[PDB]
């Protein structure tokens, strides 16, 4: 199922080097969420600080749509190793 859905997406001509297409040729809109985990080592001498966070990016890549409306298929598929995606 999931492995088949992935295979269907990359069996065609997909180039992870090419930017995702847009309807009006506009730019790819990347929504960003950010989760701070820890903020440590606030160095005042070197004026810097350490921080560990979780970066969360979300964009649309019509080329990767498999279910479209879906409602018969899984909402989403976890991308496994060995499958390149424009990022």
């Amino acid at each position: 199922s999931d492995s088949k859905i992935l295979a269907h997406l990359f069996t065609s001509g997909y180039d992870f080097r090419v930017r995702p297409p847009t309807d009006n040729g506009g730019p790819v809109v990347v929504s960003v969420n950010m989760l701070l985990r820890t903020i440590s080592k606030i160095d005042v001498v070197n004026m810097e600080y350490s921080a560990q966070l979780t970066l969360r990016e979300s964009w649309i890549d019509k080329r990767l749509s498999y279910g479209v409306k879906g409602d018969g298929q899984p909402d989403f598929v976890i991308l496994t190793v060995g499958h390149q995606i424009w990022m």
Partner: antibody, heavy 122, light 110 residues
Framework: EVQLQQSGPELVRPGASMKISCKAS????????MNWVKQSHGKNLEWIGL????????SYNQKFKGKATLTVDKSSSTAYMELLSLTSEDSAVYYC???????????????WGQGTTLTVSS | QAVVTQESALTTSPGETVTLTCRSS?????????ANWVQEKPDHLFTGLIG???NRAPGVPARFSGSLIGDKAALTITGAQTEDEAIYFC?????????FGGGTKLTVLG
């Protein structure tokens, strides 16, 4: 108060090339990027390009690529605009409009100049 | 290519609420269009009102306000004033450049 005073009106023959100025005052000149707008009688408002005083960096409208050349003189807080190969179509009023954000691009207009009227006719 | 469209002209009385709209030909006006609104008083006096994400020019009265009503950019003057009578241009950002509209000639009736 901030002010953008542009050069006076100019009359030039086709084929020639002239340069209009925009002297900024009342604000840290090198902190706000400048836009150039062309208001012609035949068309609407057109966006020519923009320049970052601090950076020297420029970005032109594909339309005016080669027609306009944005520069800047930090010492005199003045933004200049060259116009090459002037023709009938270049007869318009050229405004200079400041961007809104402080040392960053905000994509919104603050103050404009009074405008410079360029008349090109042989 | 891409064209911006505005009402040729609009009319309103002092105190009322008028709304100018800005339409994109490529589709719905989204946030990455950074809809800008510029005012032109007589004798070539241009000044910015709204733009960018949701920021405004210095001194722009509180009555002015921007939004994305429907699928086009809007500019709403709540409590129109006499001096508010001018030509309003809206500008959309398409990828790497600005595109202006035809402008709307707002008349505050006298």
């Amino acid at each position: 108060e901030v002010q953008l005073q542009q050069s006076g009106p100019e009359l030039v023959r086709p084929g020639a090339s002239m340069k209009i100025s925009c002297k900024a005052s009342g604000y840290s000149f090198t902190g706000y990027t400048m836009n150039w707008v062309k208001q012609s009688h035949g068309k609407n408002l057109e966006w020519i390009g923009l320049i970052n005083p601090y950076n020297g960096g420029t970005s032109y409208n594909q339309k005016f690529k080669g027609k306009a050349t944005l520069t800047v003189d930090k010492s005199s807080s003045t933004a200049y605009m060259e116009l090459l190969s002037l023709t009938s179509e270049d007869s318009a009023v050229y405004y200079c409009a400041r961007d809104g954000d402080y040392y960053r691009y905000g994509r919104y207009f603050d103050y404009w100049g009074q405008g410079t009227t360029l008349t090109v006719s042989s | 290519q891409a064209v911006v469209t505005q009402e040729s002209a609009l009319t309103t009385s002092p105190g009322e609420t008028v709304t100018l709209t800005c339409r994109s030909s490529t589709g719905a006006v989204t946030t990455i269009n950074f809809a800008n609104w510029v005012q032109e008083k007589p004798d070539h006096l241009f000044t910015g009102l709204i733009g960018g994400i949701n920021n405004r020019a210095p001194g722009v009265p509180a009555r002015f306000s921007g939004s994305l009503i429907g699928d086009k950019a809007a500019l709403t003057i709540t409590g129109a004033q006499t001096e508010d009578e001018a030509i309003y241009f809206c500008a959309l950002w398409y990828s790497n450049h600005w595109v202006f509209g035809g402008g709307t000639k707002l008349t505050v009736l006298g």
